[PDB]
Design a protein around this ligand. Structure first.
Ligand SMILES: Nc1ncnc2c1ncn2[C@@H]1O[C@H](CO)[C@H]2OP(=O)(O)O[C@H]21
Length: 170
């Protein structure tokens, strides 16, 4: 009746192409998986929808993308994930790097340079340091890298069982 999982990704790149192959596949394990596409813009943060679903979720599984550093909504939401995680470590995080090195995620360099080059002209000089402090930790947790040659299929099947293993054995 509630959500045992919660996703997060970049809509223009993998929302209908790659992430989708995971969601349908996951529902075949008979579990409620939550995914949203609402472009928000109704304020700056919605307590009834995004904030509630987060505290209802159990296994936060973001999916870092190449452009995971441009959307003004994604990062501020990611900061709300890992921050809530550090209070109660009963839950976990299983990131999945995708078509990006596991080196341009701990230092915001590489193909993120242009992203924070322009984001520094509008927001605070401390809020940005908060994101880079939060985004760094995600790039230290365990994660399946997806090589340009890796089967988009089998990776989905294997990563599903590891999610389903933590539920059946509890
Ligand atoms: N305009 C948008 N551009 C990109 N992603 C969006 C947009 N609006 C919403 N999202 C994403 O919808 C997801 C719902 O859980 C949420 O996960 P996220 O990674 O924080 O990016 C958000």
């Amino acid at each position: 009746v509630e959500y045992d999982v919660f996703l997060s990704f970049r809509g223009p790149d993998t929302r209908k192409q790659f992430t989708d192959f995971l969601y349908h596949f996951l529902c075949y394990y008979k579990i409620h998986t939550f995914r949203d596409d609402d472009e928000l813009r109704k304020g700056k943060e919605i307590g009834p929808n995004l904030l509630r679903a987060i505290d209802q979720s159990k296994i936060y599984v973001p999916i870092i993308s190449s452009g995971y550093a441009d959307s003004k909504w994604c990062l501020m939401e990611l900061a709300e994930i890992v921050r809530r995680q550090e209070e109660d470590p009963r839950r976990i995080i299983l990131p999945i790097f995708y078509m990006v090195d596991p080196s341009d995620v701990r230092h915001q360099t590489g193909c993120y340079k242009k992203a924070f080059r322009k984001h520094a002209n509008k927001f605070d000089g401390q809020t940005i340091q908060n994101w880079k402090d939060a985004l760094k930790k995600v790039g230290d947790l365990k994660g399946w890298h997806i090589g340009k040659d890796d089967e988009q299929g089998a990776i989905a099947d294997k990563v599903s069982a590891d999610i389903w293993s933590h539920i059946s054995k509890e």
